């Protein structure tokens, strides 16, 4: 009679199993959300670096516009990044259409 037939009841085991399943699902969804968030953070950092490069190029061209040698520099340069990407986007849109 001292030896019990079973320790606890099935309700406690069911509650423990349900809590474990809920915690597993919550941790999985939290891991997925954090992965999406770190991807978004990487994209935001990429966009910030792009904006930094853009404002640097803007300052560079604004400082070069006030120089007399910029005319001859542009006349001698056979290419330009701004016109290159402009014609690139234009041709892409044209081919898509």
């Amino acid at each position: 009679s001292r030896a019990c037939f079973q320790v606890g009841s099935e309700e406690e085991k069911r509650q423990l199993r349900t809590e474990s399943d809920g915690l597993h699902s919550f941790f999985l969804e939290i891991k997925e959300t954090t992965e999406s968030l770190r991807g978004e953070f990487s994209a935001m950092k990429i966009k910030n670096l792009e904006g930094f490069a853009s404002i640097e190029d803007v300052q560079q061209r604004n400082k070069l516009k006030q120089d007399p040698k910029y005319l001859q520099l542009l006349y001698k340069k056979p290419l330009d990044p701004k016109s290159e990407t402009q014609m690139q986007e234009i041709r892409r849109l044209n081919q898509y259409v």
Binding site: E10, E11, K13, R14, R17, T18, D21, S25
Partner: protein
């Protein structure tokens, strides 16, 4: 596929259905062997129910309890159990591997 923690239960149910004998065990083979296979399937179902894995899921628990022989769910939902004819044929499919005429009439009344 709809749930997220019922694949093991579905596999256990499929294994039990596979262990459940059909017509190739009795009729044209041996009635004693058919009764032995039925008793083995019944005791395996009772063991699987008493192990404790059927504590959760009140649906599958009630299904396994009805498969054993307890008709509490049937007595509770007799409005959906059609009539006593189907009640008797369900009792025969459950706890009657071999039916005797006098025993058949007794169970009918």
């Amino acid at each position: 596929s709809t749930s997220a923690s019922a694949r093991s239960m579905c596999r256990v149910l499929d294994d039990l259905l596979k262990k459940m004998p059909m017509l190739h065990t009795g009729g044209t083979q041996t009635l004693t062997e058919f009764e032995l296979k039925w008793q083995h399937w019944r005791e395996e179902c009772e063991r699987h129910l008493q192990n404790g894995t059927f504590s959760s899921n009140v649906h599958m628990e009630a299904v396994c309890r009805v498969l054993l022989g307890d008709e509490e769910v049937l007595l509770e939902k007799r409005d959906l159990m059609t009539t006593w004819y189907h009640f008797l044929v369900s009792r025969l499919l459950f706890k009657h591997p071999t039916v005797k005429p006098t025993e058949l009439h007794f169970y009918a009344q």
